[PDB]
Structure formats: C-alpha cells, structure tokens
Design a protein around this ligand. Structure first.
Ligand SMILES: [Mg+2]
Length: 1864
C-alpha cells in the first residue's frame, strides 16, 4: 500500500527527530533465479522501494567525515522535510526481542546524520526505523491497523520461502554471542550432564517413573474412544438440560417461569427449617452488635493527663464497678502512680533519644474481695425479631452535620491542608476543600476519630508485662475519655472499660444497636469489654474508610460536591450498611454479601434457559451465630425469590441495547445497572499482616486436606489408559494428548513451523546463564528440618523464617557462581532428605489470595529452574492472559470488529462465564509433567520429571501454639488424630506435619496450570467450530468463537448471524446445548466446574472483575478505593508518599472521576498524618511547626495534586510542579552548586533525602554473626581504594563478598524479625526519625534551579510534564453547565513506551556500555559535567568534592537519581486531550494560507515569488493583530514599529558597531570589537562579538531572565547565521557564569571552554529607536523575511515563515477555481491549474520547454514537479512476482477443525427431531443494534498515455523517450 501517505502522516518542528516507537500486533484473522535477500525485499516490495536509482549516498545533507552511508528510502516532501527510513527483519517471537534490532539500527545512523544536521541551515530531518516479526511490528512510522498485518502476511510467506533454499547457516551474527556464547555453553554443559537420580527416585516417590512419558509421546490418540465418549456425553447433557429447565411438555414462559419460583420457595423454606431445628430456639434475643458506647462529645484543648476535682462521688453507689473507678481515681489523685516508661526504641532495635519522647503509663493497684469474685469470671435461630437493625438502617443521625466544624481536632489538619493547597491556589480548590471539611464534621467521622484514637492507644499495650497487681489508665487526647487496661499473659486480646463525666456528652448517635452502659454516679462505665488483636488494624483506619463512602456513594447518585442538599433516603441505607459491616469483622458476615453477586448475575439469562439462583444455597448453611448476619441472610433470601420469577429484560432502542429493571440486593431498590454492580463489593478490604490465631488458622488447615483421602488406590487411571469416567481425582490420557496437540497446531500456524529451535535457544540462553547469584531475591523463606518433627522434642521453641540470605551467603562463600553450579548441590540435598518441607501464612483480609506457602529456600532453587521453563512456553500461546500481560483488554474488545469483517452487520452474541471449583487440591502432578515434557523439545525430560517428582509426599508445618491449645467435627478429628486414633494417616501418630500427596500449591507452581487450561480451552474451541460446521443434517451455521482464559478463570464468546424467522430460534437453541455442555467434558480432564458460573448470557461477558455489558464497560470502583489505606512498614520516610500515590493512581483506571480522586487524597492526608503522630506523643505541635516552614516530601510533608487531573501523573510530577516554581528551589540547588555536606546525599525510590531517615533497622544479625567469611573491617576503605567492583558483575570471590556487603546495608534490607502489632511499630519508626532531626542548625546555608538542571534531573518534563503542566493553566476557575449525554469513549494512554547513569561507567570506564558515538558518546560528559558542579572525570575527585561522603555511598545517587513517572491509562470523551476533561461528574486566511504553502514550491523564479503574494494581500483581508498566524496578520504591508514591540517577534539594534574594511574581493570587512543588543521574547539580551583575523566570533552573552533559554538559543543560533559569526574559538572567562557554549551546546563553568552565558537580572535594559523606513520583504529557498538592515551589508531578519504540509486544502480550490479576476493566474502556464489543483494541452507543450529553453518565468531547474510522475505511477502496481505467482490468498484461514490433529475424520450426531420450536418469545435478528464493543492528483490524465503506449529499462532498450526524460 504507499509511501507517500505514510511519509505524509508524520510531522516535526526542527533539526532532527526520532519520534516514538510503537508496537502493533495481530488482531484480525491472519490470512495466507538465485537470492538470499527474499526475506527483506519480498515484504516492503513495490513500495519500500524508491523508483529513483540511488538517491543515493547521504549527499543531500552536506559534506564528509562519514561518508554518508547508503539508506533504503530517502524521501523529500513538498515542504522541505527530509525523511530517512531503514527496514530490517528479525526472527524472534519474543516481545523485547525487537528492542535489540531497534537499538542496533539507530546505532548505524545516529552519528553521521547528527553530524550532517549540525552543518547545514534550518533543518527538518526525520529518522525512523521499521522492524517486523511473526508476532508483531515495532515502529513509529506511524501506521494503521490493516497494513500492520499485511506486513506480516508477506513476512511469513517470505520466511517459508527462505527456510528452504538455506545451507551451512553460516550467517552467525557477529553483534550477538559476545556473552551469549559464554552463557549458552554453560547451560548446554549442565543439561548434558547427569541431573537425574532415577533408580531410587522411582522409590522415593510413589508414581514417578519413566514409563508414562514414553508411552504418552509415542502412542496416537484413540479416535474410537473419543467418538464414543463425546456421543455419550452430548445426549446426557441434552437430557439434563430438558429436565433442569422445563421443556418437554408444551408450555409457554408464563407458566414455565412460575414452577421454578414455586420450587425456589420450597427450597428456601427447606433451608430455613433445617437451620431452625438445629439451633436453640429463642425468639427475642437482647444484645448489642456495636460494642462501643455511642458517645459524641465536643472536643476540647489537647492534653495527656488524668485531670483532677473531678474525681469523687457517689462513686461508692455500686461498689462492683464505680468502686473500681473511685479506687483508681483516688490512686492517681496523689501519689500512687508508677514508672512504667514506654520508650520508642526499647520498642525497636537501635541513638539515645531525648526527654520529650518518653511517656508515662502509670500503674495501678487492685481491689478488695467484693469485686474480685466478679472480675475473675469476666477476666442462633433464623426467626429472630431483628427489625431493629432495619429501623437503624432507615433512620440515622449519621449523615447530619454536627457543630464541631471549628475545633482543635481538625484545626491541626485544617492547617496542613492550607499549606498543601497553597500551591494550586484557585477558585476550584477553595471549593473542593470546604466540601471535604463538610465531611469531617458529619457526625460519623466525629464518632470514629476517638474510636481510632482508642484503637491506636490499645495497640501499644500488647506488652509491658504488668504486675500481678495491675491496672492502667489514660486520657486519650483532644477529648475527656478514660480507659482502664489490663494486659494478659499473651498477645491475643485486651480488657478495657471506658469512663466519662456525664456533662461533656452533648450528642448520642442513636438507635438501639449500640451496647448498653452502666448508669453510675454521673459517670458511664462500660463494664470490661474485650477485643482481640486481629480486629485492631481495622478500627485504626476507620475514619479513612468512612470518608470514602460519604464521598463515593454521594457521587454515584447525581449529587455535586459543590452543593448542599438533604441526605437522600437511598443514601442513608448504603452508608449505615458499610458502617455496620465494617465493625462486625466476622468472616461469615461478609460471605453473605459477596454471594449476592453469584445469585444476581443469573438474571441476565438468555432464552431457552431459566434463572436458577437457588443453586447458590449449599454454601449458606452456616452456624448462623451473630445477629446482623440473621438480617443479612433473611434479606438476601428474597433476592433469589424476586429474580427467579422475573428475569431482567432486553430493550433494543437502536442505541446499544440496555437492560430492564435491576435493583439493589440487600435493600431492594430499582436503582441503576452501573450502581448495583458496586454494591456487591461493600464489605471488602485488603491487608498483608500475618494473623496467627486459633480460629481462622483452623479452617485453612481443613481446606488443604479436605480432598486428601479421595486419591484412588489403583494408579491405572492417573497416568495410564483411558477411563471414560472420572473418580473425582483422576483423568483420561488420550483426551489430554488430543487437547495438548491442538495448542501445538494453533501456535505453529501463527508463529512457526519451526519454533522449538528458538524456544529452546531462548530458554537455554536465559535459564542458567543470566541468573547470577547475589541478585536472587529477598523473598522470606522457611527453615524447617527433620529435627523439628517430634512435638515432644521441642514443645517450647520458636520459629523465625530466615529471610533467604543465609542460603545466599553460605553458597557465595563456597566458590559458587551462575545458579548453574548451584542445582549442583541443591538437588542431592533434597533427594536424600525425604521430601519438600513447607510452612504456612495466613494473610487475613477475608478472602482472595489469603494463604501463601513459604518454600524453605532449598527446593526453591530447583523450582526456579522450572518456573521460567514454562513461563517461556506460556508466552507463545495466544489465549494466555497471565503470561502475556496486557492482551486481556484486546480480545473481548476486539471480538467486536473481528465478527464484522467476517460477516456483514450483525452480531448476535452468546457468552459464558466459566470457573473451577477446586483448582488447587484437584490437580495431580502427572498432568503438568506431561504437558511440560510434551512442549519442551528434546532434553528437558530427565530434569523436569525429577523437579516435578517432589510434590508427592510434601510435608506442611502447623503452628506451635495450635498443637499446644489442642492438648468443628474436624478439630475433634485432628485431636484424636494427634493423641490416639481414628487414624487419618495424614499426620501419623504424634508428629507435627500435615503430609499430603494430592494437589499442587497456590503460588509456587504457577504458569504451569495456565498451560493446561490453555490446551483445554483450545480443544473446546476446536470442537465448537467442528460442531458449528455441522448444525442440522448437513446445514452449516456460520459463526466465530473466541476463548480467553487465565488461571482458574475462563470465558467463551460466540456470534451468529440470523438470515430469517425460525433460523434465529432454530439456531440459538443449537448454541445453548453446545455451550451448556462444558459442565461435562471437563471431568475427563482434571477440571471440575463449580456452581459459580453463568451460562448463556446474551450480550454480556463476565471475566475477571471488569464486566463487559453490551457496549458500556463497567468496573467495580469500590474494590480499589477501600484498598487505599494499606499500612506502610518501609523505612524510607519518603517512600510512604510513593506508595500512597501508586495506590491512588489505580482508582483512576477503576473509573473514578477526577473530582473523587482528590477527596481520596484528602483522606490519605489524614491516614498519613495519623501515623507520624496525631493522637499521642504530645509534641505534634512542634512537629507541625517544623514542617510548616520547611515543607518538603523528604520529611513528613504531604503533597496534594491538582484538582483537575488529580492522581493522573505520579508523585514525580508533583515533585516537579513543586520544586520548580515556589516550593523550595534551594534545597536541591544547594546539593548541586556547592563544593566541599548539607546532608549526606542518599536517594530512596525516586526522590532523594538527608540520609538520616534511611537508618533504623537491624543489620547486626546479618553482619556480626555473618561476617565470618573474610570481609575485613577495612571493608569500606578497601572498596574506596577501587570503585570498579561496583559496576561490573564479578571476577572472583573477594569482590563478590564486597558486593554482598554493599547489598546487605542500604535500602530497605532489614532483618530483625519483628513480632509486634505493626500499628505502633510505624508510629515509632516515624516519631524516632522525626525527633532525632529536631535536635534545626543545617538550615542556614541563592535559588531557582536552572533550565538545564530540570532536564537532567526530571527527564520526562518537556515530553509530557509541560503539555499537562500548561493545559492546567487553562480554565482552572470555570464552572460548566450540567448536560446529559450517553456515548462510547476512546482508549487513551499517556506515557507508554516500548539510562542517565551509564554515562559515569564509561568516563570512568570502560565498559563498552552506552554505545554512543564519540560525538555524542564523547559529548554526553559535557552535559553531565555542566550539571552537578563538583562532578569530574576523576573517580576520586568525584569524592574530595561535595554532597557525597564516599564513592560507595554515591552507587545510590547516580543509581536512582533521575527518575520517570509511570504508565496511565484512563478514558475519555473522544480522542484529542482537555478533551479528557470532559469527565468530572474567519476563513479568508485559510484560502490565502493555502495559496502560499503551495506557491513557494511552484516552478517559479525567486523574484516572481513576491510578484504574487504582494498582489495577493490586496484581496484577502484578515483581521486584527488581537490574535503562527500571528505573523501572517503582521503583514499589513498603524504604525508597524510598535506592533512588533509586543508579541514574540525578534528585533534589536547594533549599539557598538565594528570597523569596516575594504577587502579587495567585493566585500567589506568587519574587524572591530563591537556589541549587539536585542529584545527577543522579553529577555533584553546583550551579544558581545569580536574577531581580528579571518572572521568574527562570539565573546559573551547576557540575559535578564532564565525562564526560557532553550528557545532563546535558537533565536541566537540563526541571528549569528544572519550576520555571519562563527562560534568555534574559545574565550577568556570573565565572571561567574551559569554555563558556557561550544558551537551551540551547553556546558561547565569549571572548564572555561567557550562563550559563557553569564545571566544578570539587571544586565541591560535599553533600546535605541530603530528607524522604521528601512524595512523590506524577501524570498529565498522557501522562506519569508520581513527584515531590516542594521549595518552596511548586514541585515537582520525580524520575522520568518515556513509553510507546513498539513495545509493543502481542497475547499479553497473551489473558491480559487476562476473568478477569473486573479491576473497572476492566467493562460501562461499550468499556473491556475497547479494552484487550483487540477491537470492548452501542457503534456506535449513541456517536452518542448525542456529541449528549447524559453520559460520567461518558470526559470527553475525545470524539474521540481515532473519527478512526481511516480505519484500516479505508484497507484498502478509494479510488482511482478507478487501478482502472477501469487495465487490470491484463497482465504485459507479456516479457524480450526476437529479433523485436523485427529488423523481420522469424525462423525458427531445427536437427536433433534420434534421437541419444540416455539419456546422463545422475542425478535432481535431484524433488530438494529450495531458493532459490539494526501492530495496527490497533480498530473493524472496526461499519464495514462504512457499506459496506452505500453523492466522498464529493459523495455526501453523510442516514441516515448521524451516522457522517460521526465522520469529520469
Ligand atoms: Mg470468572
């Protein structure tokens, strides 16, 4: 297709441009003498070709140091731009395997073209590269979708042709194999050696033998068994369908839809009866569900002391509970306190903090024998009357503003908010903040703040070992409340009782749902409630999880954050429910709201089928303990009685069809579709802290073993022969083979016919060759051994898990290396030691990834070797949506178009949702071994077989406290199993290890099950196609099938066109069966479909959590919002903001508008300032006053983003917005522009800090007991003696030890082995560093940052932090009017791609790294030396200088300095930006402009140019200069002089002229030393010039402001070119300059190399009265000049103009077509037909002008347009071998078929005669719905005569030579 159009697509501003490389892939259905080059010139043929013979050496860009080597295409457009492109092909199927080609191509051409573009005049040069592969195409030749595939059709064909003529494949690639040889050889050596232990391996493990592999790979599938099994299963599926739904008797939907309603009522009543009987029948219970008193007191002044003249009473009324408070008040009144002084680093490992951080916790004594007797004892039916919970959910004081808006509790944060928002000071922000304070006084965060205070306080009291005589008492602060704590012997629970004076309680939040309260003598005591520790990390972040419900839900209702309405009735219910659920943290309370999803998705069920929600019942049995759960269950048990009677309805409006009346699950309200789907995620949160405790840990032991005893005795069904029937734990062999033999075909038809010979040489190249130790991981592991099994042996020891540096070091000392001499021991170490050894972890959230297994760091090695061996096989398969990361958003969204290319307009859609019941405990390790050793080519067998022969007797280690507590029918079983019989044989008599053979593990053996599921889905597709091809007695229905599936998740999409009346109904039925049969035919494999699937949705697809409704995408937003509070235990105090911003930037992709991801930031503010300190450590005042003056993110200072575009770009963007303009602008400069230690420089993450908050952490255990292998105490000095070991990999053991020692001690590698309730462990880690810096000084050491600093330090800044940073200085204040519109949007993406430290490695070093040319490669230092003044070529002096101490410390400062904000993807309103916001719920010039953009290039003599525009400006009269068009309006042929005195032109007089000298060659000679001044874009620069020999040069530059100098340099790059000054010679440094310049470059200062640009704010502010009468207009090589002569023979261009190529209009041609008045457009030439662009007869009339030369005005070379004969000779094709020997692609793409890879044909027949046809009642086949989710004609008539008159050269070799002249 064109070269022309492709070249015409791109654009550029100046000099040289590379653009941005893009990556296209396969989306549509991919169709389809002697030489060795066919692979290249078969593709890119016909066009990639320039029909000009050479064009040639790079000549057109002038002169030669190079040669100018020969490119492929060198195009030149009609606007002067030059385009050079090169094409090359690669055979590597891996993405990123093209990066190599894209890097080695630009290397060839970057040097000479950069050299030539610097030695010519204004230049437009474009360099681009094109690379193609069998899998994709990477280019920034910015192509479209259709031809991207066309480039691969020919590529595959060319490779097929190429492979055959190939010989000794002698090409070896010299650029590769430098290290890849030394790598690959090692893996070859190893795998060629002896890894198996095969004689005793068959005995150590039950079923692992080399008799299944050989009898599996060499036996073809039995087609008879298959053709009988399918025929037996289809009839069963059909009979089951006709009876689970009622179809046999003649009925209609009406009386059909009721029978299932009646039976669902029956089933629900049955369940209710079964529950009621098995409980203590008790009608009116009485208790509280919220276990905290409903006190809301007006806060007061902050203090931490138990106030005094209160205490006394009446306390003495009871003598039980008031007596206790009286006794403690009287104890604390006088003396009786004690010195228990929690310190902040007794708490942790550490120095010597000061007095103000040690606080009191005041013992108490105890009470007499009245109440000890009572303190010692304290120290369900489904028919309950629970409607009190409803009364609470329908009436609340919750969302009702209190009167506490201005109190001391928010005044602390209402000032940090001011300081943060002090940057984006707009009217919008001042309205988006007073709408967040309105949510900080809403009567619920007020009640939650003191609850969070209490929870924080109680978290610290999990220790301190209070005496036998015991009590504690604190007044949490900001409000008078008093607690009494009593720790326990343990860490599991805490006792407390709240007391409060009866006068400060102003308001109670209401209802009868809160716990009762003792009514004492004017006090409220709360009688010793108890709270566990697993329920503590929640109550802490309670305010931050209510503000995200008062804001989110308030937004999903059509409310505006800048309005104040009454709380709607539909709002109170949604808030009072997420309030209740968040406090009853019991697991089975949320397991009921979650299952409102799988029971409501079933309402989308299509025709013939029925919504069956009552199948979700066998999971709701429960014990039914608590009270709220009762209401939840009895409400949820009506959403499956309301749906089963009336499904959701379809309504096609010609619009992309929406659905009927949906409704809320719990409270039934017919709220909208996108609104209900979030209600399924009300109770959801995430967490990572280990939750070792009795109850929950029990269920996770049952889950692992529940399918253990199921394993069959006989192994004849596991690996062996067919079964025809599964036994709940085994599968058939022949089906596995016939399924894994389909993916191997679907791979080879896209990628290969050769591919193993690349997959191997890739894996091999990667597996053991680039895995160099000393970089394995910090992944915590386990140390479990045989000496730990007997419970009687060590009943009292502990368990630390040895984060995984021990196996690292103990090997590193042993002369180890590549991880390839390491499988070396550790396999023997496992074989002769028994089996795998595994411990467990419970990350409690409620559910999800809730249990992870550690690996023991000794089977981890042999597992990492098989991880990649399968991750690389997954990367090739096309359905894999877990190896291939992003394509999951490119198969559902592309089914779409892909349906329509195939068949007209359309659709119909039929979609499933699949899943698996038990994906972990259902598989058996023979399947994965067979799949792997089936794909891995030749020698991967003896290794993978052994490495998979390890999960056969696997031993798991249960908690120690568990067994201690041992000495529900399941714990009773485990007890008997441990002490004495019935025997389980799972743990044998009396030991500690769950031992099991059945089932893979959760996360360990990953990327291997995905292969299995891929083969299964491929077989399913290849069978569905084959059945669609035979629908009814030979009649073939047509349709496409798409299968997308990750691990334990699947989906199946189908579409079919209806061309009639039964035929839709006659066809839809035939689909249902075919799609419903996947309940069967999976048990033949090891896959069991659960009851969480939904079959036959008609227009939606439910895959992972994103749902695809017909044309509108919807994603749970509430899933990620409540995931924005996770607690941070890092210790880089500045990494907390990094993590907060990272977690925030996901709510954007979650569909949250911009007005919400700023309130989320406002909440994260609280969540962040609550952890440093806000409720304890009464020095926050000082800690606030410090940051209120300093503020920087390096200390605890939070940075809020821009309200519009909130959370769009990451933290780095905010660091750029704030450091640049008015945040600091000094703390960073001082680090960069002073020599000889503000603060020792150290970088954390992306930012950089004072290296004081990067200190706390226990490095001791790794180096006091692990410095036992050399590593002398001279370690830092000995490294500093040579710093070369920091950048190269390794040479010996010693330097490897040094590298390990440097790795252990910097960031973030902590080893002490925390047991603590992490919540105080973060407040400590905050306040410690925040205090040890307060005791100022360093703060007494002028600023901005220069433009050259931002570029090196923040690289993306001009790329995309200026576009967005200038479009937000857009309406920042406006207020749009609310409209209504529904529309599909685009897919937008900002910073996608496919460094600044490698520069150092080489001046110092050698080592062949960053491949620059010695122009740029030897010019990068200059730019790198200019910046970070004190930096030099010395490896040592880098040191004797600033802000490092040491070279070792700086590997981290050059390491991340930099840094490069992430990726964000987001929607829109269509295509163009500030067109993405959006969201947040005059032609006369054009005709004239065209008549100039075409005019400058016409055949014309230069003087005839101004003959036409001068006269042209008499009729096109554009308006005022009140808004490049500005210059155009500047052409009135007022006064003009002052019109340039404004608006970004350039002018300036010559203040100090030089001396003129008459040189004897017709030219005057300027010789004196003069000065030029000017005013360009508001700088008022001075230009000092001098020269005494051959020419003049540039002495000095001055300028008044540094805001813009990258543009000013351009205005001076040409201003010397005008007047003729050279910039090569050096100067003598005069003052303190910013930087200096070489011919046109930027530099250091410290070198005194060239002309220094010494900025002086006051340098020169004068101008000198230029005379306006000397003003001309000029023309040249196409350029406009409204210039002025300043000196005799020296002119100065004021304005210029270069016409773009995107302005060649066609509407102006009509206007210009003959209003014959334009005399310049007469009868003299194709003028008036070139301009008015259409081809008396001028063809023959030009063959005369080229031989007889008499063209009074067309006096050019005579060949400027006549070379364009190829434009029309291009649309006529010239490719010989591409059309005649190219049998038209005959559409060989049949998708798949069952008769291929099954050697024999198939016959699959069922019975469909007389059931019924009239069941469906609707019509959509006739329905509307749609599309499920230049200017080259110059000379065209007079060319076809050449086609009439008639490789071309050969032909020539007469009557047409006159035309051949025009082409040559
Ligand atoms: Mg699913």
């Amino acid at each position: 297709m064109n070269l022309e159009v492709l070249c015409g697509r791109i654009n550029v501003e100046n000099g040289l441009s590379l653009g941005e490389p893009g990556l296209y892939d396969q989306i549509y259905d991919r169709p389809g003498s002697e030489a060795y080059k066919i692979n290249h010139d078969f593709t890119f043929s016909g066009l990639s070709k320039t029909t000009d013979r050479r064009l040639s050496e790079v000549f057109p860009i002038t002169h030669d140091g190079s040669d100018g080597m020969t490119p492929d295409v060198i195009h030149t457009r009609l606007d002067g731009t030059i385009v050079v492109v090169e094409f090359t092909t690669t055979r590597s199927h891996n993405i990123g395997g093209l990066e190599a080609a894209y890097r080695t191509k630009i290397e060839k051409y970057r040097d000479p073209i950069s050299r030539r573009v610097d030695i010519m005049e204004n230049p437009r040069v474009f360099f681009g590269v094109i690379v193609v592969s069998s899998g994709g195409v990477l280019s920034n030749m910015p192509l479209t979708q259709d031809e991207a595939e066309e480039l691969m059709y020919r590529f595959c064909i060319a490779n097929e042709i190429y492979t055959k003529a190939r010989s000794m494949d002698a090409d070896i690639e010299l650029q590769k194999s430098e290290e890849e040889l030394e790598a690959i050889s090692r893996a070859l050596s190893f795998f060629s050696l002896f890894e198996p232990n095969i004689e005793r391996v068959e005995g150590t493990f039950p079923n692992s033998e080399i008799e299944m592999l050989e009898q599996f790979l060499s036996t073809p599938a039995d087609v008879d068994f298959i053709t009988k099994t399918l025929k037996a299963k289809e009839v069963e599926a059909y009979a089951d369908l006709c009876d689970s739904h009622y179809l046999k008797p003649e009925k209609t939907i009406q009386e059909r839809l009721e029978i299932n309603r009646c039976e669902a009522i029956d089933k629900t009543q049955d369940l209710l009866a079964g529950l009621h009987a098995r409980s203590n029948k008790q009608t009116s219970l009485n208790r509280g569900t919220v276990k905290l008193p409903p006190w809301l007191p007006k806060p007061s002044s902050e203090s931490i002391d138990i106030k005094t003249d209160s205490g006394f009473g009446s306390l003495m009324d009871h003598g039980a509970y008031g007596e206790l408070w009286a006794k403690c008040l009287l104890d604390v009144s006088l003396g009786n306190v004690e010195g228990v002084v929690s310190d902040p680093a007794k708490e942790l490992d550490i120095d010597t903090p000061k007095e103000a951080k040690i606080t009191y916790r005041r013992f108490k004594p105890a009470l007499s024998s009245s109440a000890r007797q009572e303190f010692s004892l304290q120290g369900l039916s489904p028919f309950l009357d629970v409607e009190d919970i409803g009364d609470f959910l329908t009436f609340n004081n919750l969302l009702a503003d209190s009167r506490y808006g201005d109190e001391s509790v928010q005044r602390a944060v209402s000032i940090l908010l001011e300081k943060a928002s002090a940057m984006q000071d707009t009217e919008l922000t001042h309205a988006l903040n007073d709408s967040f304070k309105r949510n900080l006084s809403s009567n619920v965060v007020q009640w939650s703040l003191w609850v969070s205070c209490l929870a924080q306080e109680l978290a610290s009291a999990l220790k301190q070992h209070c005496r036998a005589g015991e009590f504690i008492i604190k007044k949490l602060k900001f409000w008078p409340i008093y607690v009494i704590i009593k720790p326990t012997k343990s860490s599991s629970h805490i006792f407390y009782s709240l007391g409060i004076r009866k006068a400060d309680v102003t308001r109670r939040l209401t209802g009868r749902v809160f716990s009762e309260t003792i009514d004492a003598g004017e006090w409220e005591l709360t009688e010793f409630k108890s709270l566990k520790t697993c329920k503590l990390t929640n109550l802490v972040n309670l305010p931050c999880t209510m503000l995200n419900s008062i804001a989110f839900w308030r937004e999903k209702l059509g409310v505006a954050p800048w309005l104040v309405r009454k709380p709607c009735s539909e709002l109170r219910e949604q808030v009072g429910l997420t309030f209740l659920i968040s406090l009853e943290d019991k697991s089975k309370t949320e397991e009921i709201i979650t299952l409102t999803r799988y029971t409501q998705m079933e309402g989308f069920v299509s025709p013939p089928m029925l919504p069956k929600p009552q199948k979700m019942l066998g999971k709701l049995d429960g014990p039914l303990r608590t009270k709220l759960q009762v209401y939840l269950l009895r409400k949820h048990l009506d959403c499956m009685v309301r749906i089963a009677s009336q499904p959701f309805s379809l309504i096609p409006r010609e619009g992309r069809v929406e659905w009927g009346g949906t409704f809320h699950a719990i409270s039934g309200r017919s709220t909208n579709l996108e609104n209900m789907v979030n209600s399924w995620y009300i109770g959801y949160y995430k967490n990572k802290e280990e939750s070792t405790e009795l109850n929950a840990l029990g269920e996770m032991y049952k889950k692992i073993v529940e399918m253990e005893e199921d394993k069959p005795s006989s192994p004849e069904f596991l690996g062996w022969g067919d079964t025809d029937s599964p036994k709940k734990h085994e599968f058939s062999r022949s089906f596995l083979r016939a399924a894994c033999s389909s993916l191997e075909r679907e791979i080879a038809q896209r990628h290969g016919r050769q591919w193993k010979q690349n997959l191997e040489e890739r894996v091999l190249r990667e597996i053991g060759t680039k895995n160099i130790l000393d970089l394995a991981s910090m992944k915590a592991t386990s140390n479990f051994s045989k000496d730990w099994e007997l419970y009687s042996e060590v009943q009292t020891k502990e368990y630390h898990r040895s984060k995984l540096l021990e196996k690292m070091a103990t090997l590193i000392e042993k002369g180890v290396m590549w991880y390839i001499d390491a499988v070396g021991q550790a396999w023997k170490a496992v074989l002769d030691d028994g089996c795998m050894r595994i411990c467990l972890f419970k990350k409690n959230q409620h559910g999800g990834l809730r249990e992870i297994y550690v690996m023991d760091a000794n089977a981890r090695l042999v597992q990492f070797g098989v991880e990649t061996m399968a991750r690389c096989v997954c990367e090739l398969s096309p359905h894999e949506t877990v190896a291939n990361p992003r394509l999951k958003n490119s198969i559902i969204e592309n089914h779409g178009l892909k349906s329509a290319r195939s068949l007209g307009p359309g659709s119909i859609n039929i979609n499933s949702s699949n899943d698996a019941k038990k994906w972990n405990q259902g598989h058996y390790t023979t399947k994965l071994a067979l799949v792997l050793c089936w794909f891995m080519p030749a020698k991967f067998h003896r290794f993978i077989w052994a490495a998979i022969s390890m999960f056969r007797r696997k031993k798991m280690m249960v908690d120690l406290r568990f067994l201690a507590h041992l000495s529900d029918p399941f714990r009773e079983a485990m007890t008997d199993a441990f002490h004495g019989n019935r025997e389980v044989s799972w743990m044998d008599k009396g030991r500690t290890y769950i031992k099991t053979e059945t089932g893979m593990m959760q996360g360990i053996l990953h990327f291997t099950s995905s292969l299995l599921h891929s083969c299964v889905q491929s077989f399913y597709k290849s069978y569905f196609v084959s059945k669609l091809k035979e629908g009814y007695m030979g009649e073939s229905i047509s349709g496409v099938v798409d299968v997308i599936e990750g691990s334990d998740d699947s989906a199946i999409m189908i579409s079919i066109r209806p061309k009639s009346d039964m035929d839709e109904v006659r066809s839809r039925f035939f689909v249902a069966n075919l799609l419903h049969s996947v309940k069967f035919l999976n048990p033949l494999f090891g896959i069991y479909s659960s009851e969480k699937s939904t079959v036959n949705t008609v227009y939606c697809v439910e895959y992972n959590s994103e749902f695809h409704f017909h044309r509108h995408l919807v994603r749970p937003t509430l899933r990620w919002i409540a995931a924005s509070h996770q607690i941070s235990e890092t210790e880089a105090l500045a990494s907390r903001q990094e993590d907060y911003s990272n977690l925030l930037t996901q709510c954007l992709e979650g569909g949250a508008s911009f007005s919400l991801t700023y309130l989320i930031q406002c909440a994260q503010l609280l969540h962040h300032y609550m952890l440093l300190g806000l409720c304890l450590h009464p020095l926050f005042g000082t800690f606030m006053g410090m940051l209120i003056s300093d503020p920087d993110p390096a200390l605890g200072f939070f940075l809020m983003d821009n309200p519009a575009f909130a959370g769009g770009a990451g933290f780095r963007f905010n660091l750029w917005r704030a450091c640049k303009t008015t945040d600091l602008g000094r703390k960073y400069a001082y680090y960069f522009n002073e020599i000889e230690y503000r603060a020792l420089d150290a970088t954390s993450g992306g930012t950089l800090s004072h290296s004081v908050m990067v200190y706390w952490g226990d490095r001791k255990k790794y180096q006091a007991l692990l410095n036992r292998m050399g590593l002398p105490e001279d370690w830092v000095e000995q490294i500093d003696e040579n710093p070369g070991v920091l950048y190269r990999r390794a040479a010996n053991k010693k330097e490897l030890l040094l590298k390990l020692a440097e790795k252990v001690h910097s960031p973030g590698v902590t080893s002490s082995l925390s047991k603590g309730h992490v919540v105080p462990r973060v407040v400590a880690a905050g306040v410690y560093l925040l205090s040890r810096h307060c005791f100022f000084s360093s703060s007494i050491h002028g600023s901005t940052q220069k433009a050259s600093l931002i570029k090196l330090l923040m690289m993306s800044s001009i790329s995309a932090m200026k576009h967005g940073g200038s479009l937000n200085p857009n309406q920042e204040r406006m207020l749009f009017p609310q409209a209504q519109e529904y529309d599909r949007v685009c897919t937008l993406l900002e910073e996608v791609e496919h460094k600044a430290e490698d520069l150092v490695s080489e001046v110092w070093f050698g080592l062949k790294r960053t491949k620059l040319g010695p122009r740029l490669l030897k010019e990068e230092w200059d730019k790198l030396r200019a910046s970070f003044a004190w930096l030099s070529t010395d490896p040592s002096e880098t040191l004797r200088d600033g802000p490092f101490l040491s070279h070792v410390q700086f590997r981290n400062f050059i390491a991340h300095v930099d840094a490069k904000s992430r990726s964000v993807r987001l929607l829109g309103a269509p295509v163009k930006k500030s067109g993405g916001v959006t969201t947040i719920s005059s032609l006369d010039n054009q005709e004239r402009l065209e008549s100039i953009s075409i005019l400058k290039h016409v055949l014309f003599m230069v003087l005839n140019g101004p003959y036409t525009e001068e006269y042209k400006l008499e009729m096109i009269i554009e308006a005022f200069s009140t808004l490049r068009t500005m210059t155009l309006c500047l052409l009135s042929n007022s006064i003009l002089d002052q019109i340039e005195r404004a608006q970004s032109g350039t002018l300036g007089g010559f203040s100090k002229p030089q001396k003129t000298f008459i040189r004897p060659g017709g030219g005057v000679g300027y010789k004196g030393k003069g000065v030029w001044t000017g005013v360009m874009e508001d700088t008022h620069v001075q230009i000092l010039i001098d020269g005494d020999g051959t020419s003049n040069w540039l002495e000095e530059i001055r300028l008044s402001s540094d805001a813009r100098l990258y543009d000013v340099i351009e205005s001076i790059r040409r201003l010397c070119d005008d007047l003729g000054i050279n910039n090569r010679v050096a100067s003598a440094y005069r003052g303190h300059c910013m930087v200096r310049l070489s011919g046109f470059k930027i530099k250091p200062a410290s070198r005194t190399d060239g002309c220094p640009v010494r900025i002086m704010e006051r340098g020169f502010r004068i101008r000198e009265l230029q005379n306006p009468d000397e003003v001309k207009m000029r023309v040249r090589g196409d350029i406009l000049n409204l210039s002025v002569t300043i000196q005799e023979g020296r002119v100065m261009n004021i304005l210029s103009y270069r016409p773009r190529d995107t302005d060649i209009s066609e509407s102006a041609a009509a206007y210009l077509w003959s209003n014959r008045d334009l005399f310049s457009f007469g009868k003299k030439e194709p003028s008036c037909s070139w301009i008015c662009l259409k081809t008396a007869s001028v063809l023959l009339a030009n063959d005369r002008k080229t031989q007889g030369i008499d063209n009074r005005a067309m006096g050019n070379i005579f060949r400027d347009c006549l070379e364009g004969s190829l434009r029309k000779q291009g649309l006529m094709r010239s490719k010989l071998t591409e059309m005649v020997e190219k049998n038209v692609v005959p559409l060989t793409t049949q998708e798949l078929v069952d008769i291929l890879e099954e050697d024999i044909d198939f016959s699959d027949v069922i019975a469909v005669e007389l059931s019924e046809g009239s069941l469906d009642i609707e019509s959509i086949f006739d329905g509307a719905p749609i599309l499920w989710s230049v200017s080259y004609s110059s000379k065209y008539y007079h060319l076809t005569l050449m086609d009439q008159a008639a490789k071309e050269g050969c032909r020539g070799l007469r009557c047409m030579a006159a035309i051949r002249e025009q082409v040559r």
